Structure formats: C-alpha cells, structure tokens
Amino acid sequence: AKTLLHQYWDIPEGTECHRKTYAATSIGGASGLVVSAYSVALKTPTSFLEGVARTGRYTFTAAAIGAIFGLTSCISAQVREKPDDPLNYLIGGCAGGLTLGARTRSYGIGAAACAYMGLTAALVKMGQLEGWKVFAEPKV
Amino acid sequence: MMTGRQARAPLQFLPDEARSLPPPKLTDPRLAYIGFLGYCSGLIDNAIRRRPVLSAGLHRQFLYITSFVFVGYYLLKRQDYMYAVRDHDMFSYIKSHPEDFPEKDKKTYREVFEEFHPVR
Amino acid sequence: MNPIILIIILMTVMLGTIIVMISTHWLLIWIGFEMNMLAIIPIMMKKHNPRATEASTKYFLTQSTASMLLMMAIIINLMFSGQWTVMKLFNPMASMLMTMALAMKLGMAPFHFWVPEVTQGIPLSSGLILLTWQKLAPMSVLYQILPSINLDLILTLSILSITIGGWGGLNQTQLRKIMAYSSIAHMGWMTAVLLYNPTMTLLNLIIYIIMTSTMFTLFMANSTTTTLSLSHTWNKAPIMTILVLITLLSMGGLPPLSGFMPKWMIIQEMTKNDSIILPTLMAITALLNLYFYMRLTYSTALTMFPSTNNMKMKWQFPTTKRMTLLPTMTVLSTMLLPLTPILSILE
Amino acid sequence: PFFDVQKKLGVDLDHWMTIQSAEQPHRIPARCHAFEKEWIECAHGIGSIRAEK
Amino acid sequence: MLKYIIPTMMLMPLTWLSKNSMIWINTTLHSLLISLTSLLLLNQFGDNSLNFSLTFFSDSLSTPLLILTMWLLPLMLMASQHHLSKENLARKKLFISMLILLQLFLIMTFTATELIFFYIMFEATLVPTLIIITRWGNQTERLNAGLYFLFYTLAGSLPLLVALIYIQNTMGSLNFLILQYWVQPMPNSWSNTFMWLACMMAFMVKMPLYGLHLWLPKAHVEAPIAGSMVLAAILLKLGGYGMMRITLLLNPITDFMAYPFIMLSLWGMIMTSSICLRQTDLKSLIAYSSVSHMALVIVAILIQTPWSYMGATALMIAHGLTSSMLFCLANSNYERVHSRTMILARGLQTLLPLMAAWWLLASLTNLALPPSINLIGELFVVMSTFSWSNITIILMGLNMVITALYSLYMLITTQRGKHTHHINNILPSFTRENALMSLHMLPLLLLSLNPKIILGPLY
Amino acid sequence: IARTFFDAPEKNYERTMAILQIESEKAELRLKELEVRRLMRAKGDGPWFQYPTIDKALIDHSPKATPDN
Amino acid sequence: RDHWIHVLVPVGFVFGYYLDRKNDEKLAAFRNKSLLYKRELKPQEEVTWK
Amino acid sequence: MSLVYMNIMMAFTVSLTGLLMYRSHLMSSLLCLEGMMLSLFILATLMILNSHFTLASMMPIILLVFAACEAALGLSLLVMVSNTYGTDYVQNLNLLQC
Amino acid sequence: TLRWQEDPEPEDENLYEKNPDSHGYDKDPAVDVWNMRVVFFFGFSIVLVLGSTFVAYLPDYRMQEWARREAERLVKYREAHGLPLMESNCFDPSKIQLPED
Amino acid sequence: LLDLIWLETILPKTISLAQMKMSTTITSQKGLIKLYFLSFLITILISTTLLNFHE
Ligand SMILES: CCCCCCCCCCCCCCCCCC(=O)OC[C@H](COP(=O)([O-])OCC[N+](C)(C)C)OC(=O)CCCCCCCCCCCCCCCCC
Ligand SMILES: CCCCCCCCCCCCCCCCCC(=O)OC[C@H](COP(=O)([O-])OCC[N+](C)(C)C)OC(=O)CCCCCCCCCCCCCCCCC
Ligand SMILES: CCCCCCCCCCCCCCCCCC(=O)OC[C@H](COP(=O)(O)OCCN)OC(=O)CCCCCCCCCCCCCCCCC
C-alpha cells in the first residue's frame, strides 16, 4: 500500500487526470477489498454467491468513491490554476461523499459524508503541504 | 532512557552516590501530603466496615499514617536522586561536546528588527 | 479447591512471571510463559460450569497460538544471529512475529476477540488476576526489544486498540465486558507511548493496575456482576457508591484525579517527537471510555434506582468479606496527582 | 522491566547458554567461534546504536 | 495566595464537625469572614502586578473575579438551604462540601501563573458542578444536561491541552510572566491556524459561542439554584479569563482568524435575544440572556483594543451579579408555585410588592440602565466595536432594543396584570429571600460609585 | 491601610525579579535538556539510550579440541 | 473551649499569612539589588524588607 | 540459505493456516497446533546441529516436554467440553457471545 | 394491576404556620433567629460597610494620582524651558540602528 | 428551526448516532472461535503482503 500512495503523490496536481484517477481508484479498491475480506470473515455469508456479491459491492463502492474524488480534485486544480490548495481537495472530498450517498441511496448520509470527508481530504492536503507527520519517527 | 546508567549496578534502590545528596526533611510538604493520604485511607477503612469514622481504632489510623510516611520518604529519596543523576548527565554531556552547543550571539534590541502589525 | 493447592498454583503463576522478568535467555522467556499459562488455567475453572470451560478453551487456544508464534520468532532470530540473549532482534520477520505474538498475549485489537468472552466466563477474582497480572510479562518483553519494533505496526495496533475498545465498551451492560474493553483501550495507550519513552508506559501500567484492582475489589465486595445489581448498592452501602463514583471518574482521566496523569504525560511525550495528530485522536477516542464510565456512575451513584423488599433482610447483617487493601488503592487511584514527579523513580 | 536478579545475586542461571562462543563441554568449538568472538569484542560496552554502525 | 486557600479548605472540617442544625450558620459565617478578608488583593500597582510566589499571582483582571467568587459562596449557601430542608444530614454536608471544593478550585484558577496549572484547575471545576447538577437537580433530564455540559467542555478542551503542551515544548515555559517578555509573532500558515483553533475553542465553548451554546439552556435549567448561580456568575467567565490570557501568544494571526467568530457572535446575540422574546420558561429565558451577554464579551475580547478589554471585564462582573440575582428571583417564584412556566403565576405585585421592587431593579440592571456598571461595560464595548467598524452600531442598537423588550416582557408578564385566580399558596416573602436579594443588589449599586476597581489591568 | 495590610512596592518589584530569574533559568534548562536528548538519541555516544549488547566476559579463551578457531 | 469550631478558620488564615511571609523571605534573592531601588543601608538595620 | 529450511518454514505455515481455519472439530485444531510444534522441533534441531552449538542440543527436549504438557492440558479441556455437550464441535462453544 | 410500592408526594410545609415570626431560615425558632442575626450582622454591618470604607480609602489605586502629579511636574519643567511637551518618538533615534536597505 | 432542530442536528446528534452505529457493528460478533481465527489469518496476511510490516 506504500507504493500506491507514492504513485498517487508522484503525479503533479492538475496535470494528468487519467493517471491520478487510476491511482485513486486503485487505492479505493484496495481499501474496499480489505473491508470486504473482514466482512466475509467475521460476518459469514449465507452462500458463496452472497459473499462474492458483497465483495463486489463494497469494492465497487470504494473504487467509485476514489475515482470520483481523484477526478474532481484534479479537474478543480486544472480549472482554477491553483495546484497547491486544499479547496480542491475539499471539493473532491464532497464529491466522494455524494458518490457514497448515491451508492447507499440516501441523501442524509451522503451530505454528512460530503462534509466530513471533504474536511478529511482538506486536512490530508494541508498535511502534505506543511509536512505533518502521522506516524512520527522517535526523535528525542 | 537511563538503563545504561542503571545497568552496571542493577536492582539498587539507592546507589552509594545518592548519599552525597541532601536527604528530604521530615517537614517536607510532599511527606505531609503522603501522611494525609494515609490518614484518608484509614478513614475510608473505618467507613467501609461501618465503624465510627473519627473514633474507632486509633492504632489502625496511626499505623496507616506511619506506613505511608515511611514508604513515601524512601520514594522521595529515590526521586531526588534520579533527578540529580539526570542533571549530572546533562551537564557532563553539554560540557563534553562544545561543538554542538555553541554560544548564541546575543544582540540588544537596538540592532534586531521586528515587524509591526497595527491593531486598528 | 484445596487451600494449599490454590497457594501452590498462585505461586506458580507468580514464578512464571518472575522467570519471564529476570531471565536473559529466550528459551527461558518461553518457559516462563507456558508455566504461567498452565498454572493460571485452573484459576479460570474454579467454579466448574460450562461457561468457565468454554472461556478456558478459548484462552488456551489463543495463548498456544501466540506461544507458537513466539517460538517461531525466537528460532528465526537464532538462525539469523546465532545467540539467545534477550535484547534487540536481528531480523524484521522475527520482530514482526514476536510483536504480533505479544499483541495476541496482551489481547490488543485486532487480536482482541478473546478478552471480553474470557473475562465474562470466569469469576471476578480470576478476571482480576488475568487483567492485572497477566500483562506484566508481555510488556516487560516489549520493554526489552524496543530497538527492533516496527513503528508503523505498533502505532497501528495502538490506535486500533483504542478505537475498538471504546466502540466495544459503548454497548455492554455486564461489568466484566466493560472492564475488558477498558483494558483493551488502556493497552492501546500504553503501547502507543512505548517507542518514545517506555517509562511513561510503566507509569501508565502501574496506574491502570491500581485503578482496575480498586474497581474489581469493589465489585467483589458488593458481589455485583451486572449494571442493575450494581445500581442496588445505594440501598445497602452508600459509601461504596461514593467510592465507585470517584474511581470511575478517575478511570476516565478527568482531572484532578490520578487517572489524568498517565494520558497527560503520554501527550507530553508524544508532542516532543512532533506527533500531534495521534495524541489528539487518542484523547477524542478516550472520550468514549469516559462516556460509558459516566453512564455507570449515573446508574449507580448519582441516581437512586428502585430496590426490592429483601434489601431489609440484607440491612440486618454486616459484611465480613476480606476487602484487602481496598482503602489504600481507593486513595492511591484518586488523590495521586499532586505527587506526579514521583514518576522519576521508574526510569 | 528487566530485573537483573542474576547480576545482583551473583548466580548464573542462563548465561552459559546465551551465546555460542561461551564455555562448551569438552572444549568443543563451534563453526563460527572466531567470528562471534570478534563481533562480541566489538559490540561490548558501546551500546547498540554505536555497534550497529 | 495561601492566605485564602487554607481557610477555604478549613471550611471542610467546619461543615463536617458541626451540629445537625448549625451547619448553615457556621458555614455562612466563616465564608462571609473570608469574603471580607478577600479585599486585601486590591494592592495593585500602575506598572507591576501583585506577584506572590512562583505559582500564584493576581493582577487587576483576576482580582474582581476572585472577590466575586468569594462573595458568591455565602449567597449560594443562603439560597440553597430551603430546598435541602428535608434532606439527609450527610447529603447536606456533601452538598456544602462540593460548594467549598468548587470555590477552592475557582480561587486557584484565577491566580495560576502557569498556564497548565490554570488548565488543570479549569477542568477540575467540571466535577463538582456536574455532580451538583446531576444529583440535586429536580428533573428527569438533569442527566442529559450533565452529559451535554461535560462532553461539550471536554471536546472543546482536549486540543487546548495538546496546544498548551506544544507551546511549553516550543517556547520553553508556560509561565505567564515569562511569556509576556518571550513572546514571538505567529505567522500565517495552516499549522498556526490550527494552533489558534486549538487554543481558542475551549474558551469559545465555555463562554459560550453561538452554535456551541446548546449545553447552556440545559445545564442552567436542570441545575439547583446554587448550581445555576455558580454556573451563570463565575463559570462562564473562565472562558473570558482564558481568552484574555491566551491572546498574547496568538498575534498577529488573530486579526483575520477572528472574523468568523465575530460574525457568529454579532449575529448570535440577535438570535438569542429573539429567542428570549418567545420563551415560555423563565429559567431558559435567563440562560439565553446570558448567552447574548457572553457573545458581547466574546466580540470585545476578539477585537482586542483597550476600551474593549475594559468593557469586557466590567460587563463580565456586572452580568455575573445580575444573572445570579435573576436566577434567585426565579427560584423564589419556583418555590412558591412549583412550576417554571412564565404564564402560570401572574400579577404578583399585588401580593408581593417588595419582591416586585427587587424584580424591577434586576430588570433595570439587565437592560443596562446608566450609571450601572452593566451600562459602563456595554457602552465601552459598543465604542470599541464602532471603532472596529461602523455597521456594528446598527447591530448593537438592534440588540439593545430587543434586550429592553425582553427584560420588560419578563417584568410585565410575571409581576403585572391580573393575578391568577386558582393559586392561593403565595406566602409572604421571607427575610432570607429579601436578604439574598439585597446582598445581590447593594454591591451592584455601590460599584457605580467607584467603578475603577473592575476595569481590568489596563485601566 | 498601606502600613498594616499592604506590601511595599519595592518588595513586590524585587520579588518579581527573583521569580523571573528562577523561571528563565528553568526554561533554559528545559530547552537544553530537549537538545541533549535529541543529540543522544541521534548519535548514541552519551550515557543515555545505551541499549545493552552481549557481555564479553562470557567468551571462553582456553584452547579447544580443534586448532582452527 | 466550647467554641473551637469557631476558631478553626481564623487560625487557618493566620497560618496562611505566616506561610506567605516565610515564602516571601524565601524569595529574597534580589533584595536591595534592583536597579530602581538600590540604595545604601541606613544604620541600625540590616535588610531593606523582611 | 539452505533448502530444507524453506521446506520446514512452508510446513510450519501450512500447519499454521490449518490451525487458523477451523473446520468442524477441536481435535483437528489440536493436531494442527502439535504439527506446528513438530515443525519447530525439526527447524531448531537442524539449525543447532549444523551450527555445532553443543550446549543448545538440550533445547528441543525441553521444547518437546513443555509443548506436550500443553497438549495434555488441551486434551483435558477437550474431554471436559465433550462431557458437557456430547461432542467436540467448535459451534457449541458460543455461550459467551452474550 | 397496581404499580410498585412508593410513598405519595408529601404536602409542602408552610413555615409560617407553626412559627408566625419565621425569617425562613430554620424550623427551630432559636436557630432561625440566630441565622438571621448572623447573616444581617456579618453581611451588612461587617462586609458591606467596612468593605465600602476600605475601597473608598485605597492608597492611590494603580498610581493615578501620582501620574497626575508627575505630569504636572513634567509639563511645568518642559513649558519653562521652551521644550516640546511630547515628542513623536518614544526612544532616541540616536540609539537605534535601522536596517540597511 | 435553528437551535431546537438544526444546531442540535449538526454537532451532537449526528456524532452520537455515528458512535451508536459503530458500536452496534463492532459488538455484533457471533462468538465463534473459527471466525476469530479466520480474522487473525486475514490480519496476518494483510500485514505481511499489503502493508509490508516485515520489511
Ligand atoms: C466542541 C467541539 C469542537 C471542538 C473543536 C476543537 C478545535 C478544532 C481543531 C483542533 C485540531 C487538533 C489540535 C491541534 C493542535 C495544534 C498544535 C500545533 O502545534 O499545531 C501545529 C502543528 C504543526 O505540526 P508540527 O508543529 O509538529 O510541525 C512543526 C511545524 N512545521 C509544520 C512548520 C514543520 O499542527 C499539526 O501537527 C496538525 C494540526 C491539525 C490537526 C488536524 C486533526 C484534528 C482535526 C480537528 C478535530 C477537532 C475535534 C473533533 C472531535 C469533536 C468531538 C467529537
Ligand atoms: C470589586 C469586584 C468584585 C465585585 C463584587 C463585590 C462583592 C463584595 C462587596 C464588598 C463591599 C463592596 C465593595 C465595593 C464598594 C463600592 C463603593 C465604594 O467604596 O465607593 C467608594 C467611593 C469613593 O469615592 P471617591 O473615590 O470619589 O472619594 C475620594 C477618595 N477619598 C475618600 C480618599 C478622598 O465612595 C463614594 O463615592 C462615596 C461618596 C459619598 C456618598 C455618596 C453621596 C451621594 C449619594 C447620592 C445622592 C443623591 C443623588 C441623586 C439620587 C436621585 C435618586 C436616585
Ligand atoms: C513495573 C511493575 C512491576 C510489578 C509491580 C507489582 C505488581 C503487582 C500486581 C498485583 C496484581 C494483583 C492480582 C489480583 C490479586 C491476586 C491475589 C488473589 O488471588 O486474589 C483473589 C483471591 C480469590 O479468593 P476468593 O475467596 O475465591 O475470592 C472471591 C471472592 N470471595 O482473593 C480475593 O478475592 C480476596 C479479596 C481481596 C483481593 C484483593 C487483591 C488486591 C491486589 C492488588 C493490590 C494493589 C496492586 C499492587 C500494588 C501496586 C502495584 C503497582
């Protein structure tokens, strides 16, 4: 999962929409596959068909969220000519939240996901710009 | 952190270097607070067993206070020793490495420049 | 159970823990672990009901899997280093296997699934012995091998443990399951601060041991295992309601109680190493532990739930249980914050 | 915690097994006695951080 | 500051060793003696603060708050002794003990030189108030009120602890006397933006800010009378003291990071006053009035000018006294009629004339009748906000009109009109209630003669 | 009032100076301790962060059964 | 005494004042050394303040 | 390194995946656990004998003794649950979900 | 059916019934009158009156009167010698090194 | 509309419902050892391959 994040962040922002979208979709699909694996492990399905349907549904939802977020953020960076700006990532996060609402087919969870994941994507953008460390190496 | 210090002479509560330090006074405020902790535990011991709290078993409350004072005195001795060791190691390492700890060129305020942000 | 056989078995448990603590050989660490587990199995099965045998079976399977993983890590380290001295490891695979073996033995998430069921199936005294004494040896082994521990793995285990423990304890009504999820969250905190300053880990371990011992001792003093039976305590002994109120407030880390000191010093240590997001996330997550603690205090001390008729028959008799060290750990778990600089004795 | 009971008490409970270059019965040498002896004579007394480099 | 701490902790053996009938007399007497003793803090100098020790100091901002706390404790002892009449003796002593402990934490909070000691005392104040509300409150939802209050405060305050520890590690000290001379500019970045948010949100929640005020019309309502008095009079001012102390480190990033909260608090006071216009509950109406006045204090602190600071501290003291008196009057009505509905008991001036006079005086000071210190604080904040921008005079004038409207609506509804026919248990006013009202009123009127002792450290 | 209850301005002045000197010394010592801890962690040549190694007093030096060792 | 409970608190205030004076004496490192109040000692005294 | 080491690691991994996925019986889990111990025995014995570490030759005996005592305890637990339920199925050990 | 066993709500006690001279402090008349005397003496006669007297005679609170006297002295001294009463710069420009640009 | 409906909706009620839903998902395990050990195997595989904790 380390090489997926580097290959997503190696592309300059607002430059290559297709490759950024593909990298975001791959990251989303990996996360959805992990979620589906734990789901079919702990909550066992009725049959093989129900389990593979749940796996496909979760993976497709997460991959669609990733693709929509990447495409929206890259397009907003292209249009505004502001590559280093967390507003583009906020727009992409709200687009991903609206996609999550569309997949689950309910408006309220979609709006809440728009707000919360737009804030989260903006925070990730600020951390990338300012060099915030989440798993900080021991120093003192 | 300090296991290299406490590695050549292991499992010692107070090494022989601790005796060069001033012992805590018996009127130490921390020691008095630990004695108050002992008194409070004695009162709780009276309370949970449905005894008169301030009257029953004065020997029990005295032993509570005495035990707390004893253990707290030795813990305070160890704490003071370990902070002394911390400072000693810090100063020895600062003195032994003068290249890494240069003297800061202090400047008066007539030479330094600070931006002014008006509040209006 | 014979008193003498019980004495011998308890000293065998402490002997296994001592053998793990004092030895410089990996095989002796393994030997102490199996001695401790083999001796502690009959403490779980003191009552001989199907729930105790089920809990003992799950505990045995989990500890045996963790022990085999530990032996695998030791053998890999011997293969790649040719020695057995308990110190930093010479292989990342051996370090990963040993870290996950110690995580399985501690019951940290996602290996946490055995802790609440095992704690529920066994008596209160054996559950106290488990959740207090069984965690001294894996944390000592972790304290000995910190130069080889992967930072990402241990931090992931820590944050997962804290979140899963809080979310799990939100839903429980049995007291033993609440104590188990609380334990999971606290081990998350302890192994979170492990790689930066292990003295903070020792301080958090000591404070958690004292607070858990106080809460379990109050539970066996009142013979309560559910929320409602604990809520009946106001009509039997209100001093115990005051004690459980102050101890549960201190367990949530509310200042100026002694439970504030571990997370305060942990946040102090984590910000020195330029890690700011994780201590904020762990504090916000520990608010959930505070939530179900406060729910318990609402049901027990700050309201008067309806009682029954036979409480009068219980009024006419005094208690005779040996509430050993209960006032001492009640005082030491609430009014220890002014003695915070005492943590320098643990370095 | 690693309570060094053996060094405090002077007993030798598991140090004889702890390395391959130690005192072996009938003076039987190991295959890598010399290399291990040289590595130990390096790493002694300088800590793990200095001995790793 | 040990000459006030030690008698406060000696109040505890006084209430735990008194007779079954002499606990109120002893506690009230000795708390009044310590309140008289608290006047020795007025040895303030024009250049230097009164620095007692390494841990304690008291400048001209913390001194009025200290005197207010130490004077407020015997008022709560006098107020809370009628509804605790039939209570068990041990529970009565526990109630008095929680009041004593809260006063101890409050007087250790305002004098803390170190910022982390201020934080520790400021969050130690949570436990006695939560216990008082959730134990001696009368309603069902006192538990929900306690949960809301506790979790709003802790969710606001944990990032403050993280940011204070960061400031300690970066600057080297949290001593307020050191930080006055060692302060550095805070540049514009995202890191400093979240520093400002972390340092400010705890006191924005505790004040409260509009939008974070949802815990106030619950904790102020389901509490007992002493709890409501100590929540309205002192506990809202911990946020004001915190923003006055912590704004020193947050420059010059405050000048643009203060815009959204200035718009929240300028529009928020209009919303809360309009809410006050249509309230069926008297206690909730007083709580929302408190929200509006603390929004005024928030704006005054955020624009950070000398006139705004003087108006903010004067308004804090004045609103504490006025809100305490209003809560006491509402409690007396509640003891008479056993309901908090404002429309139930009407026309009480024909039955309770001197209580109606006390109601009129409290209402007059609520709408800032000059030359009360209410009007002095409100006027100074209005002048400073006019200096900030000119349309603030439009907002302030609208707020003043609605404030007069709801205060006189309170008075006209409760006291005037035709009395309720079927209510016949309206007893004459006791000497205790009248003494409580006069002890709230007379310091408030006397402070208009010498208003210079409540105008902050930059008078 | 100023003779009985209040304190002299000189006393408060010099007391504040003493407090400021003590607290500035404490802050400088805290910063120096942070820098020392960082340097000792990075280099490993100081008395702190001395992780243990194999003790060389355990090595057998007597002649073995095989010369090539 | 039959009214010792009425003298618990004033002796607490007196003891707190005494501890305040003791600590003020403890913080006397810059007595008669400040650049604003430095002066020669008048005879028949040894310190500027106590 | 050598090849028989790779085969013993793969045998240990196979027995571990067998233990970590129960089918029906507790006895199959115990058999997978004891196969894991046997693979540990073979690996450690081969390493010690090839390295000519003379004093380490006592380790596999102690390992065998301790893990066989473990297996005796596990067999006793299996017999107890079989006496409780009439079979050693792992789906009957689900009372502690509540 | 009939619900759980619980006492009904007790009737409110009128303090003026058994004691028409009540101040509302306590049910015992002696404790009540002594509480009234304590509150009225130590609240109004002691704290309010002597507190107002103490605040009224504060020894030059925050040096305002001294500042006025010193301003009078400085204005007289500067007016006598033709000096400007106040300068635009608080510190001397001679002892200030501006950054070179 | 604002403080009785919406200001109550955004901050406290949505957060409370989210924590309630997460708690109900976490604690809904079926109490089977086989599923727990399958989850352990999945965790080991994810850490070894997808997360590279053995490097
Ligand atoms: C009552 C409800 C509302 C509560 C609101 C509370 C405040 C909101 C913002 C809090 C942010 C978290 C604390 C930040 C402390 C920053 C200290 C600092 O040094 O900052 C600079 C540091 C900078 O890192 P550094 O200082 O290590 O690096 C050195 C400096 N540079 C970058 C130049 C190299 O900032 C950070 O490390 C990250 C700050 C942002 C953190 C974002 C995650 C939290 C998001 C908000 C959560 C709010 C509560 C949510 C839960 C509510 C209840 C359910
Ligand atoms: C202080 C912060 C905490 C706040 C809460 C405190 C609670 C505890 C209370 C403790 C005691 C009270 C403390 C504050 C006391 C304030 C009062 C005080 O001391 O003032 C000093 C002030 C001091 O005034 P001064 O400063 O001008 O005096 C000069 C100073 N000396 C005396 C040294 C020369 O006292 C007065 O102003 C008294 C003046 C004389 C009396 C009044 C005469 C006129 C009265 C009205 C006449 C009619 C007018 C028209 C009416 C029409 C109808 C309405
Ligand atoms: C760096 C740190 C290194 C290590 C430092 C030292 C760590 C000490 C850890 C202590 C762990 C305690 C474990 C639990 C208690 C052990 C004793 C025991 O077996 O107690 C249970 C026993 C069962 O008897 P039974 O009659 O069946 O009880 C059922 C109720 N009728 O008896 C009972 O139930 C009797 C009822 C009372 C039991 C009270 C037990 C209190 C034990 C904890 C004391 C406080 C913690 C130790 C001191 C501080 C250490 C930091």
How many domains does chain E contain in total? 1
Q: Which two tokens stand for residue C111?
A: 């290996």
CB environment C5-38: b (16+ within 10 A), e (fewer): eeeebeebbeebbbbbbbbbbbbbbbbbbbbbbb
Is there a contact between E45 and I24 if contact means CB atoms under 8 Å apart?
Answer: no
Beta bridge partners of D19: C83
Which of I55, I57, I58, I64 to mutate to test ligand 2, by most ligand atoms within 8 A of the CB atom?
I55
3-state helix, strand and coil shares in percent for chain D, rounded to the nearest 5: 45, 0, 55
Which residues, 6+ apart, have CB-to-CB distance to D52 below 8 Å?
A: none
| C-alpha closest to that of E95 among E127, E131, E142, E122 | E131
Q: Which two tokens stand for residue B70?
A: 């004893």
Residues with a CB atom less than 6 Å from ligand 2: E 64, 67-68, 71, 317, 443, 446-447, 449-450, 453-454; I 47-48, 51-52, 55-57
Is there a contact between E44 and I62 if contact means CB atoms under 8 Å apart?
Answer: yes
CB environment I10-36: b (16+ within 10 A), e (fewer): eeeeebeeebeebbbbbeeeebbbbbb
Structural contact between residues E166 and C271, judged by C-beta atoms closer than 8 angstroms: yes
Residues 91-110 (B) with a CB less than 8 A from some CB of I: 110
CA distance C60 to C122: 14
Report chain G residues whose CB lies below 8 A from the CB of F21: 29-30
D47 lines ligand 3 (CB under 6 A): no
CA distance C157 to C143: 16
CA distance A116 to A93: 8
Is there a contact between J42 and A1 if contact means CB atoms under 8 Å apart?
Answer: no
Is there a contact between D48 and C86 if contact means CB atoms under 8 Å apart?
Answer: no
SS (H, E, C) H11-68: HHHHHHHHHHCCCCEHHHHHHHHHHHHHHHHHHHHHHHHHHCCCHHHHHHHHHHHHHH
What phi-psi label fits residue I62: left (phi over 0), alpha (psi between -120 and 50 degrees) or beta? left
| C-alpha closest to that of A66 among A107, A39, A106, A35 | A35
For G40, phi and psi rounded to 5 degrees?
Answer: -75, 140
The shortest C-alpha distance from C103 to chain B (Å) reads 23
C220 lines ligand 3 (CB under 6 A): yes
Ligand 3 nearest-atom number relative to CA C133: 11
The shortest C-alpha distance from A122 to chain E (Å) reads 11
Is there a contact between C272 and A140 if contact means CB atoms under 8 Å apart?
Answer: yes
Structural contact between residues E406 and E277, judged by C-beta atoms closer than 8 angstroms: yes
The helix/strand/coil state of A65 is: helix
For J5, phi and psi rounded to 5 degrees?
Answer: -125, -55
CA distance E10 to E74: 15
Report chain J residues whose CB lies below 8 A from the CB of E211: 7, 11
Q: Determine how many CB atoms are found less than 10 A away from the CB of residue C204.
A: 25
Q: Determine how many CB atoms are found less than 10 A away from the CB of residue C92.
A: 16
CA distance E187 to E167: 15
Q: Which of A127, A132, A135 sits opposite C151 (nearest CB)?
A: A135
Do chains E and B touch, with touching meaning 3 or more CB–CB pairs less than 8 Å apart?
yes
Q: Is F12 on the interface with E (CB under 8 A)?
A: yes
In E172-305, where does DSSP find H-type helix? 176-179, 190-206, 216-222, 225-230, 237-246, 254-257, 259-277, 282-303
Interface chains of chain I (3 or more CB pairs under 8 Å): B, E, F
Structural contact between residues E106 and E231, judged by C-beta atoms closer than 8 angstroms: no
The helix/strand/coil state of E275 is: helix
Structural contact between residues H49 and D16, judged by C-beta atoms closer than 8 angstroms: no
Interface chains of chain C (3 or more CB pairs under 8 Å): A, B, D, E, F, H, J
C199 lines ligand 3 (CB under 6 A): no
Interface chains of chain E (3 or more CB pairs under 8 Å): A, B, C, F, G, I, J
Report chain H residues whose CB lies below 8 A from the CB of J37: 19-22
Resolution in A: 3.2
Domain boundaries, chain B: 1-97
Ligand nearest to the CA of E453: 2
Q: Which two tokens stand for residue E50?
A: 């009164």
Q: Is C294 on the interface with E (CB under 8 A)?
A: yes
Which of E63, E450, E453, E455 to mutate to test ligand 2, by most ligand atoms within 8 A of the CB atom?
E450
| C-alpha closest to that of E286 among E348, E248, E334, E338 | E334
Q: Which two tokens stand for residue A118?
A: 């737009």
DSSP string, A78-102: HHHT-SS-HHHHHHHHHHHHHHHHH
Q: Which of I12, I25, I28 sits opposite E432 (nearest CB)?
A: I25
Q: Which two tokens stand for residue I60?
A: 């030059």
Q: Which of E131, E159, E169 sits opposite C280 (nearest CB)?
A: E159
Expressed in angstroms and rounded, the spacing between residue C213 Cα and the centre of ligand 3 is: 7
Residue E409 CB-density burial (10 A; 0-12 exposed, 13-18 middle, 19+ buried): middle
DSSP string, E27-53: HHHHHHHHHHHGGGGG---SSS-EE-S
Ligand 2 nearest-atom number relative to CA I48: 11
In E43-172, where does DSSP find H-type helix? 62-79, 89-109, 115-124, 126-136, 142-171
Structural contact between residues C195 and C119, judged by C-beta atoms closer than 8 angstroms: no
CA distance D24 to B5: 32
Q: Which domain holds residue G1?
A: 1-50
Q: Which domain holds residue E348?
A: 1-459
CA distance E299 to A97: 35
Q: Which two tokens stand for residue E239?
A: 């946020």
The experimental method, as deposited, was cryo-EM
DSSP string, C28-62: HHHHHHHHHHHHHHHHHTSS--HHHHHHHHHHHHH
Residue type, B40: C
CA distance C120 to C176: 5
CA distance E215 to E212: 8
Q: What stretch of H or E contains E214?
A: none
| C-alpha closest to that of C146 among H89, D2, B32, D37 | D2
CA distance F33 to B91: 9
CA distance H96 to C174: 12
| C-alpha closest to that of C75 among E138, H45, E452, G46 | H45
HSE-up of residue E280 (Cα within 13 Å, Cβ side) = 3
Expressed in angstroms and rounded, the spacing between residue C40 Cα and the centre of ligand 3 is: 14
Structural contact between residues H91 and H81, judged by C-beta atoms closer than 8 angstroms: no
Report chain D residues whose CB lies below 8 A from the CB of C88: 48
CA distance A28 to A18: 15
Report chain D residues whose CB lies below 8 A from the CB of F69: 29-30, 33-34
The answer to whether the peptide bond before residue A83 is cis (omega within 30 degrees of 0) is no
CA distance C217 to C330: 10
CA distance B97 to E13: 57
Q: Is H11 on the interface with J (CB under 8 A)?
A: no
Q: How many residues does chain F have?
A: 69
Ligand nearest to the CA of C210: 3
Interface chains of chain H (3 or more CB pairs under 8 Å): C, D, J
For F49, phi and psi rounded to 5 degrees?
Answer: 60, 35
Q: What domains, with CATH codes, occur in chain H?
A: 1-86 (1.10.287.3510)
CA distance C19 to E65: 59
Structural contact between residues C180 and C213, judged by C-beta atoms closer than 8 angstroms: no
CA distance E15 to C338: 25
Q: How many residues does chain B have?
A: 120
Structural contact between residues F51 and C88, judged by C-beta atoms closer than 8 angstroms: yes
Structural contact between residues H93 and H29, judged by C-beta atoms closer than 8 angstroms: no
How many domains does chain G contain in total? 1
Ligand nearest to the CA of C221: 3
Breakpoints of chain F, after residues (C–N > 2.5 Å): none
The shortest C-alpha distance from A124 to chain C (Å) reads 11
